[PDB]
Each structure stands twice: as structure tokens, then as C-alpha cells.
Write a protein that binds this ligand. Sequence first.
Ligand SMILES: [Zn+2]
Ligand SMILES: [Zn+2]
Length: 104
Amino acid sequence: KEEMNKVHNIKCHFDNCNRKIHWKIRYGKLRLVDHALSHQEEKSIDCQKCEYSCQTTRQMRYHYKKIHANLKMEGFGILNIPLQNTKFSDVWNKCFGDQLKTIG
DNA sequence: TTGGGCGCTGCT
DNA sequence: AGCAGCGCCCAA
Ligand SMILES: [Zn+2]
Ligand SMILES: [Zn+2]
């Protein structure tokens, strides 16, 4: 539980990003996945109610709040997102590849 | 207006 | 462990 709550700065190595995500194991990987998806041109997150699509689950959460105000957004975990493919594996590697021992 | 992401955590 | 969500400060 201690090692659960330790801050690990995860550095994004995408060209001229170099942002540091102040991550914790407790948070899970969603904010890291979303950050990598933001560096990719594809809009692989699809709304469950309308035609909208976007890059990140954070974008989709904003979409639901504004367009689907009375509806819960559901099914947008890393296990629901199409991640097991080469395009995403490549972008994840570019951003965080040297830090996968810490991420898992 | 959009929304990154900090910090949160109910739940499995 | 860590998923899969959320409130909200502030310019990512
Ligand atoms: Zn980055
Ligand atoms: Zn929609």
C-alpha cells in the first residue's frame, strides 16, 4: 500500500513532448494510455450513444458531460479500448518504452 | 470551450 | 494491484 502510493514521474519521450506524468500504481494506466493516444492521429474512442469519436477517454468524458449530460459513460477502460495492435504498441513504446518495468 | 491531468477512490 | 471511473484547477 506504501509502494502503491509512491509518486513515479513517467516521462513522455515523444518528439518535443518531454512532459512528466506524476503517476502512482494505484491510478492504473489509463492516464498513460490516454497520453500516448493523444500523440496518435487516430480517433479510436467511439461514443456509445452518437457518432462522435475522439483520441482519449478524457475527451470522451468531456463529450458525455456536454452532449449526454444525464448519461453515464461506461466501457472506456484500457481493457475496452483497442490497444492490442501495432500502431498503439509503437506509440506507447515511443512515449514510455524505457519505463515499462515501472508501469507494468 | 476544450480538455490535460492532478488527485481522488469504489470496486473487482 | 490496479481497473475505470470523477471533480475541478487552470492552460496541460
Ligand atoms: Zn507526450
Ligand atoms: Zn456521443
